[PDB]
Design an enzyme around this catalytic site. Structure first.
Site, PDB file in Angstrom:
ATOM      1  N   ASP A  56      10.247   0.803   3.329  1.00 48.18           N
ATOM      2  CA  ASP A  56       9.611  -0.164   4.263  1.00 48.18           C
ATOM      3  C   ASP A  56      10.576  -1.290   4.416  1.00 48.18           C
ATOM      4  O   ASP A  56      10.964  -1.934   3.426  1.00 48.18           O
ATOM      5  CB  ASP A  56       8.303  -0.594   3.639  1.00 48.18           C
ATOM      6  CG  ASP A  56       7.517  -1.581   4.525  1.00 48.18           C
ATOM      7  OD1 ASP A  56       8.136  -2.227   5.362  1.00 48.18           O
ATOM      8  OD2 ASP A  56       6.241  -1.607   4.387  1.00 48.18           O
ATOM      9  N   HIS A  94       0.828  -1.166   0.000  1.00 52.16           N
ATOM     10  CA  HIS A  94       0.000   0.000   0.000  1.00 52.16           C
ATOM     11  C   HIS A  94       0.890   1.253   0.000  1.00 52.16           C
ATOM     12  O   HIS A  94       1.766   1.383   0.828  1.00 52.16           O
ATOM     13  CB  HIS A  94      -0.815   0.039   1.242  1.00 52.16           C
ATOM     14  CG  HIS A  94      -1.715  -1.146   1.375  1.00 52.16           C
ATOM     15  ND1 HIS A  94      -2.722  -1.412   0.464  1.00 52.16           N
ATOM     16  CD2 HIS A  94      -1.674  -2.186   2.233  1.00 52.16           C
ATOM     17  CE1 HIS A  94      -3.301  -2.562   0.808  1.00 52.16           C
ATOM     18  NE2 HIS A  94      -2.676  -3.054   1.858  1.00 52.16           N
TER      19      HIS A  94
HETATM   20  O1  LIG Z   1     -12.334  -1.768  -0.793  1.00 53.96           O
HETATM   21  C1  LIG Z   1     -11.274  -1.408  -0.260  1.00 53.96           C
HETATM   22  C2  LIG Z   1     -10.431  -2.300   0.451  1.00 53.96           C
HETATM   23  C3  LIG Z   1      -9.312  -1.736   0.987  1.00 53.96           C
HETATM   24  N1  LIG Z   1      -8.936  -0.432   0.821  1.00 53.96           N
HETATM   25  C4  LIG Z   1      -7.735   0.176   1.387  1.00 53.96           C
HETATM   26  O2  LIG Z   1      -6.766  -0.886   1.382  1.00 53.96           O
HETATM   27  C5  LIG Z   1      -5.883  -0.804   2.523  1.00 53.96           C
HETATM   28  C6  LIG Z   1      -5.946  -2.193   3.169  1.00 53.96           C
HETATM   29  O3  LIG Z   1      -4.854  -2.266   4.128  1.00 53.96           O
HETATM   30  P1  LIG Z   1      -4.889  -3.123   5.416  1.00 53.96           P
HETATM   31  O4  LIG Z   1      -3.606  -2.896   6.172  1.00 53.96           O
HETATM   32  O5  LIG Z   1      -6.047  -2.894   6.231  1.00 53.96           O
HETATM   33  O6  LIG Z   1      -4.885  -4.695   5.046  1.00 53.96           O
HETATM   34  P2  LIG Z   1      -4.415  -5.599   3.805  1.00 53.96           P
HETATM   35  O7  LIG Z   1      -5.345  -5.319   2.730  1.00 53.96           O
HETATM   36  O8  LIG Z   1      -2.950  -5.233   3.589  1.00 53.96           O
HETATM   37  O9  LIG Z   1      -4.506  -6.892   4.449  1.00 53.96           O
HETATM   38  C7  LIG Z   1      -6.504   0.303   3.366  1.00 53.96           C
HETATM   39  O10 LIG Z   1      -5.788   1.550   3.176  1.00 53.96           O
HETATM   40  C8  LIG Z   1      -7.954   0.428   2.851  1.00 53.96           C
HETATM   41  O11 LIG Z   1      -8.594   1.738   3.101  1.00 53.96           O
HETATM   42  C9  LIG Z   1      -9.792   0.400   0.112  1.00 53.96           C
HETATM   43  O12 LIG Z   1      -9.517   1.570  -0.054  1.00 53.96           O
HETATM   44  N2  LIG Z   1     -10.900  -0.131  -0.433  1.00 53.96           N
END
Ligand SMILES: O=c1ccn([C@@H]2O[C@H](COP(=O)(O)OP(=O)(O)O)[C@@H](O)[C@H]2O)c(=O)[nH]1
Length: 447
Positions: A106, A13
């Protein structure tokens, strides 16, 4: 310039490091986002104030992670190609009259620090997970804790005033508590810290008030400075902020659907961008949602949605909306949003905190079990789903947790805590706040 290298995978991200970069540009620095060639060609650039640059992970035309689904093999391939191409980038930048002043990276890619140091470029590690989890990994790296990490080790750290909660077996980070299950992720987690003492700066996307003991220990042990929550200024009420309706208002169709729901009525549901749920797990989750009787916005990614049956999708039509992706910050800021059933990924957790939304936590792995324990026990801003004796999440449990946060005797406890932490998060990032101060220090250092 300031080079920004988030973890160079499509699943990574970029936005938290970009928001740090935007704050550095406010202070006059010049940021460049460094991504893979694959990511560069498949996503829109960030725009002003950023330049963009690329490295390679081995796979400039296809997704390296789809090609190489064994995690250890993907990471070794990324290191080999990434380190080569990052070195080449540092040289080409210098030859283009933009020598890098500092590389913000990172450390889930720790080869980047070696490469930059060898180019004579300063380095700043950007920890993207909570202090609580980070410090446990660091204690293993520093050979103060053996593998596997146990609840006894965690109880020691609570007793010594390092952790602010007592972590049980389901709360300790599985990559170090059950390392045989994920060898490559165990190594990645620990090697983040290997050599971190050589960096010029160490930064973490958290705020001190949220994890005070943990942030204090990370600062004294690893020089880590809190710089979060690293989110858009708008959501932090930072004008550089009057009455609350989102001025950053999109045209996304799911937002039109949310506009028609009553205040605090909707459950947002997401298990993030990486985890995969089998058909049986999707069926328990979706039936739980329907059985709750609440309106809900269910994110089911395009690559997962084949697993949804016709009949469950139809059942979700009554009160729910299923989408492949939503503008999650905008959703969480929306007046219709009542709670967030989340896997408790750290970015999702921080977004929930900044918007004062109570949580139903459904963790899988990485930092999520730990975060989910803080949610339920220290922060008090929600509840964690309880799995049955075989480790299965049942529809009745999904439903019971939704109801418990939206309608239970302690509904107002979860809301109170969410609102309390929202205000502290905003304070930390406003001028003179604990995180803002560390951003300003960094910016002056590299000016
Ligand atoms: O429909 C979605 C799903 C996820 N996200 C963004 O994706 C990131 C997901 O990061 P997270 O650390 O929660 O978990 P991961 O997806 O890495 O397991 C966050 O910034 C969310 O706001 C989003 O914008 N829309």
């Amino acid at each position: 310039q300031v080079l920004l290298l988030p973890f160079p995978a499509a699943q990574g991200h970029t936005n938290p490091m970009l928001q740090f970069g935007r704050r550095l540009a406010y202070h006059g620095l010049r940021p460049t986002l460094v991504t893979t060639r694959y990511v560069l060609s498949t996503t829109p650039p960030p725009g002003d104030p950023f330049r963009v640059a690329a490295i390679s992970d081995g796979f400039d035309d296809a997704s390296g992670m789809a090609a190489l689904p064994d995690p250890g093999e993907y990471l070794r391939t990324l290191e080999a190609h990434g380190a080569r191409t990052l070195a080449e980038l540092l040289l080409s930048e210098a030859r283009a009259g933009r020598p890098a002043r500092v590389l913000v990276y990172d450390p889930a890619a720790p080869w980047a620090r070696r490469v930059a140091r060898a180019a004579g470029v300063a380095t700043a590690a950007f920890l993207s997970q909570p202090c609580a989890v980070d410090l446990i990994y660091g204690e293993v790296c520093a050979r103060r804790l053996a593998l596997p990490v146990t609840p006894t080790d965690a109880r020691g750290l609570y007793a010594r005033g390092v952790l602010g909660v007592e972590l049980g077996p389901d709360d300790v980070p599985p990559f170090v508590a059950a390392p045989e299950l994920t060898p490559a992720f165990c190594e990645q987690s620990i090697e983040q810290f290997a050599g971190l003492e050589d960096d010029d700066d160490v930064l973490v996307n958290s705020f001190s008030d949220l994890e005070p003991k943990e942030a204090a220990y990370m600062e004294s042990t690893w020089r880590a400075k809190t710089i979060g929550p690293s989110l858009p200024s708008f959501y932090l009420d930072d004008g550089r902020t009057a009455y609350g309706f989102n001025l950053f208002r999109s045209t996304v169709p799911c937002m039109e659907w949310l506009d028609k729901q009553p205040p605090r009525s909707v459950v947002l549901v997401s298990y993030g961008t990486v985890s995969t749920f089998d058909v049986a797990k999707l069926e328990e989750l979706g039936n739980g949602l329907c059985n709750s009787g609440k309106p809900f916005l269910w994110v089911v990614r395009s690559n997962e949605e084949h697993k949804l049956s016709v009949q469950l999708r139809k059942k979700c039509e009554k009160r729910g909306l299923i989408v492949p992706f939503c503008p999650q910050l905008e959703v969480l800021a929306h007046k219709a949003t009542g709670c967030f059933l989340s896997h408790c990924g750290w970015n999702s957790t921080l977004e929930a905190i900044v918007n004062g939304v109570p949580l139903v936590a459904m963790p899988h792995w990485a930092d999520q079990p730990t975060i989910s324990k803080y949610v339920e026990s220290l922060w008090g801003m929600g509840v964690r789903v309880q799995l049955d004796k075989s480790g299965i999440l049942q529809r009745e449990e999904v439903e019971r947790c939704i109801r418990e946060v939206m309608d239970g005797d302690r509904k107002e406890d979860y809301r109170r805590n969410a609102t309390r932490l929202m205000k502290k998060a905003k304070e930390s990032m406003q001028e003179g706040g604990s995180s803002d101060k560390n951003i300003a220090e960094f910016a002056a250092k590299y000016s």
